[PDB]
Amino acid sequence: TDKERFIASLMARMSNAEKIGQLRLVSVGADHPKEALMADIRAGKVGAIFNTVTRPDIRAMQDQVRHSRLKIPLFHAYDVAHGHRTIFPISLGLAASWDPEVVARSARISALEASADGLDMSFSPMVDITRDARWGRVSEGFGEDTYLTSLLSGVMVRAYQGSNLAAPDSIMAAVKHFALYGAAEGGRDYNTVDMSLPRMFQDYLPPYKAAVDAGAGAVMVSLNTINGVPATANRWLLTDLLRQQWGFKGLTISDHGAVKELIKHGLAGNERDATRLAIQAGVDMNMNDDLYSTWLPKLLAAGEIDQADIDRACRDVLAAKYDLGLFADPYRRLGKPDDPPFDTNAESRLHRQAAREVAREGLVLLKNRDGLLPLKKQGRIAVIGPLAKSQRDVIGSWSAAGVPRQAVTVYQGLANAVGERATLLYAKGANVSGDQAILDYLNSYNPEVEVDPRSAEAMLEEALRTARDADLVVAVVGESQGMAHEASSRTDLRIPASQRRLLKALKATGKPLVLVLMNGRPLSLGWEQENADAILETWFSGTEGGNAIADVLFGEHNPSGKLTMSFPRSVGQVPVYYNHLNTGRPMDHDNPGKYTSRYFDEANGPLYPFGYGLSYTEFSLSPLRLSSERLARGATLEARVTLSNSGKRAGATVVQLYLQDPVASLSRPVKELRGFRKVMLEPGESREIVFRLGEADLKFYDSQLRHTAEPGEFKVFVGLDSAQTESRSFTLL
Amino acid sequence: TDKERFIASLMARMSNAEKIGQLRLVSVGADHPKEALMADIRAGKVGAIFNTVTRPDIRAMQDQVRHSRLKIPLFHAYDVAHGHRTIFPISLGLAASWDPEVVARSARISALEASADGLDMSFSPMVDITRDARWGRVSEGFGEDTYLTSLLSGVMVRAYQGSNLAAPDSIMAAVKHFALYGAAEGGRDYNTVDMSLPRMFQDYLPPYKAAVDAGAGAVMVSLNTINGVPATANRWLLTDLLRQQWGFKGLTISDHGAVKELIKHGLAGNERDATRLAIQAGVDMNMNDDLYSTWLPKLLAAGEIDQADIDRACRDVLAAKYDLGLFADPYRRLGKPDDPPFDTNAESRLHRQAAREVAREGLVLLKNRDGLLPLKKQGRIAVIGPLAKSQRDVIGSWSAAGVPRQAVTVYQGLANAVGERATLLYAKGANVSGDQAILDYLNSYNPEVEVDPRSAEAMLEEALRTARDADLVVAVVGESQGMAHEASSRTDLRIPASQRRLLKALKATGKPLVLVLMNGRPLSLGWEQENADAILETWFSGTEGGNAIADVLFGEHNPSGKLTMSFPRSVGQVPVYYNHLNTGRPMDHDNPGKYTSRYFDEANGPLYPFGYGLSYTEFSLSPLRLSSERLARGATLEARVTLSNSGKRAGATVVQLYLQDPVASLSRPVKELRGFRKVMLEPGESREIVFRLGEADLKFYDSQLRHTAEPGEFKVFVGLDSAQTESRSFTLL
Ligand SMILES: OC[C@H]1NC[C@H](O)[C@@H](O)[C@@H]1O
Ligand SMILES: OC[C@H]1NC[C@H](O)[C@@H](O)[C@@H]1O
Ligand SMILES: [Mg+2]
Ligand SMILES: [Mg+2]
Predict the structure, then answer these.
(1) What is the extent of the structural domain holding B478?
(2) Fibronectin type III-like domain spans which residues (chains A, B) (predicted)?
(3) Would you say the C-alpha torsion B107, B112, B117, B123 has a positive or negative sign?
(4) Closest ligand 2 atom to B140 CA
(5) Closest protein CA for atom 7 of ligand 2
(6) Cα(B311)–Cα(A430) distance, rounded to whole angstroms?
(7) What's the total number of domains in chain A?
């Protein structure tokens, strides 16, 4: 192959200093001042940059490469999680679209905008399975389901990379965080992960394998222990599974300071030993801590590592740079040398219409009493709450190069929608938290949350007056983006107390109460489900979020979002997830018993189940029909249902197919998602939906990690959520 | 062996109907009316009885055996968890004594009283490791620590069984629940258990192995899945581990309906298949569901099981009956019918003095502002709260044949202590819950909780009046015993809301506030720790609990209890446990950082850590001294410290020794308990404490379950709790 000969030929000319230099991944900042970094690039001591994100800045780095002996080009990476400049909903919101094409569009546009600024790589997609709502990084994933997350994992990779990694509108996908990062004990970030191999193989690993199989060029290794072994030192995970079993041929990248952290994990007593563990486990590239550059020469000289460990890692970095086209033209994403200067943040370089259309699809209607929604554009509308005018929160956590001043707030979305037809009245009502320590945490690094100097009582008095002067209240409440963020684990899943006090006070006005929720995690909403007139889940909906939200509230878009993560009744029920085991003593709702698996001091089950979301119309399903009672090995089974819009407005819903294996060599879940179809229907319109199932859909990992479909009964469920299904049985032969 | 020959010789004369009859374990109930059961005993269709617990009732069962062809004697079993008639503190409270001799005494007296009533066996000790306070069965274990629970597991078995299982003051120990029952996901009873084999072998399995190694005659198999396989169907657990690797020679007993529940777990489509899975996994004896008696003949006839499966199970039952002496004399625990009559419940048959002395040892002083405790016997003492006059709650869950009317309430204990020297003023103050649905749940089977018909406001008004004219308030608050019980999982770890409203109202009177907590699980006590003057944790202290509690409150006993389970600040922090891993990013208490493993919305770490407990005196430790800096393989290390009573009152504390292995092939806990010494000291008295460490204390299970000690540094910590330690290092060679 031309590639392996080109790289072998280059590596033949390289010193070990230069080979080791290729493994170093750094960003400009206090740890690495710009001038020292420029010198290191010229010395061949830098392989890649992260957090340098504009054409002039990236050109200036790539210009330093020209001064190096071998002129090996840099690659430039960034956290393009859910948009680059045009910010789409957070991934948890994108997942709620239940539309691979909507997700692909957000990823395609992200890659286009990032590559347009000179970037070659995103640290995305994040594909960690999340069953614990306390974890601040649940916003970054696709929810609790292995099938949906695996599917969207593949979609994100393919959308980012396109048909050619050398294309100037493509970037390389570095799938993260390999592995199991979202199972952190207590939902505390960075915390211990401990799980059985059958659960690991069946539920948590498939999304990373889906990204590898979609051709992801890079894998970012996680910060957590797996069964006592940090992923960064886990040769089983990075060599035996990722390379030998899965056949991954690309680049492994450490997370930030992950190699040095092997000391705190207690796998290493010093930096030299930590360095040896990471490179021999199969970590190619060393983020920020510089341990590889410091210790690899001494390890090699001493015979503590092999030349083959350095060569493997170096070949992987050069092979990434080759696939990205950077050996053909290191300026392929940076334009021509006499291109005129331009404003990186020009309105003309955004994709607002795409962001607005994508953002509409993820909004989930959780409650709508007496058809209060959609609203009429008339009278007086009170817009109340600390998130109503927040540009910083609507773009969410991991907002990349998104500019808060360019974002549309919920307030501005309503003003754009009503024009002169209605009067909008604003009141802040409350600070995002009443706890000064939480406000100081959120404002610790930068001013992220505006702290109103009024007393809580004064802000409430203004909100009650505003509400009393309106026909209805749109309360814009929930989390600031810093509350659903790396290292922001919550012990309380409710709306913050300052905002719940505001909601209780607004009920005293007797005005219809619409809640617009902004949040990066499932919330506990028992009070709200009892007391609010309508509830719209908007996650953090991005740059055009306010416009998409007004589109739903005024009925231009019929809410079509469905949850991809169960909403617990309280943090005391964590974890709750739809695909749980039956136990030997399941709750019997027809014959309730004390001696069943349940809590006695709270209603059982999630407040809102996986796949739940309402519409402004009604939908019906015909009885489920299977193509046969028996399925021969290697044949496919057809499951058929007719969906009807039995209401008065056009709208979409999601037909969900679930499977149960009720008798197996392992206890298998009560249901597992195995298919879905999002369908848009006119009033009175019907569509026949056909699902195809084969052996592949019936397999599970048994006690001995055999991936097998066992003969016997399977139950097929079809429904518009995980809770309201009809089922039919067949036998596998 | 005479034993093997006796059993072989009996089994030679037995039909398969009789062999199968030996496996049937039943109790009188709706499922098995007394007379049907008596007829079955006469027909040789019953192997053993549970929940028949008096000499006349057991004599009548054993009398029926005479009518059967082979006259094989029954054994009789019961849940003697923490006392038979004289009720000791719940196991969680017994553990807090940190005194193996106090635990052995409670077990010895339990076996004495149980055997005196005719019982041969207890379904005890319960030795499940518990890290999740939501689980209702936490009360039945010894807390979160593998070393302490394993130690006490051994102590309970040896105290029950004595030097001879045929002794009429001995019973057989059936250690439960094998295995991992207390790691239930969500702390929901009966729920999924999923963990790595290294965590399983290092932390959760050793207590069951400790009971096997102490010579436990029986093992009760748990109701939960382990990594997807119900324990009842788990051939790896019951045959490979328990029989071949651990060398257990005794009897395996299913939990209640566990065999039939294999259908609900989804391992079996029918009773016949469930029966086959349980007997071939290695379950000898079938509790209540009668599947063995129904299906084993058909399974054998059809060649679905071997004769060897029936013979193995039958030999194990006959071998237990042999060891219990029942073939020598089936009436050895039952005296003779012409014996002088006695009342089963006679005061003369109780052990009140032992119960009072044992109960003093487990009480944990959690707070004592400005030396409010101990109280003087003078003035006016308001005794307020729904647990003040509760006889049913002081004896706790699994109270066996304990008679509530024989128990000493906290109120009666204070009356007994003060005589005419002080005036006691009572007010109920609140019901145990303000939620009528929780009260109805607690009163579902029997009247367990007295519901005052007065409004919450009327009871508060009376309590405030009582408080107003007293010198101080002893608030007796917490859980009823039915809240910390099999199948009573909580989503809230606080004192119930009706009682917290009462505490806030009492705090507002400005009167000194002493909290006497009754509870079967760790509670979240943030408000109480901030606001109460003194807090005494009494668990459920048993038959003499009120007397032991008054002994501590008036200073006759200097509180010496220490926690064996971490108290979380809230249910949102679950799990918290002292022997956690460091992570790559631990909270730094000298330099707190956002990007650490923590919550942002609540103070971090437990409110009260493992090993915490105050005294009415103060104690000092001299610097820790190790016998050498290096330890040779097979040598023992000595760790020496001097403990002093530096205060004015005699009292006991517990010197705790912890070990850390800071560099290993797995990430190892920050600390692990490896020794302790409870020491009683006069004011100004000193004692030299010497701990011995060898290789056995330094070993751990690596990723491949190699059990060895790796050469390198170990850190030794000594202190009066897990949080406040001094450390010294040595090197293993
Ligand atoms: O920002 C770079 C890198 N740092 C930290 C995060 O854990 C990861 O998600 C991100 O890609
Ligand atoms: O009472 C019989 C048996 N049933 C249920 C419990 O799980 C166990 O602890 C007890 O021994
Ligand atoms: Mg099956
Ligand atoms: Mg070591």
Answers:
(1) 351-618
(2) 653-722
(3) positive
(4) 9
(5) B255
(6) 73
(7) 3
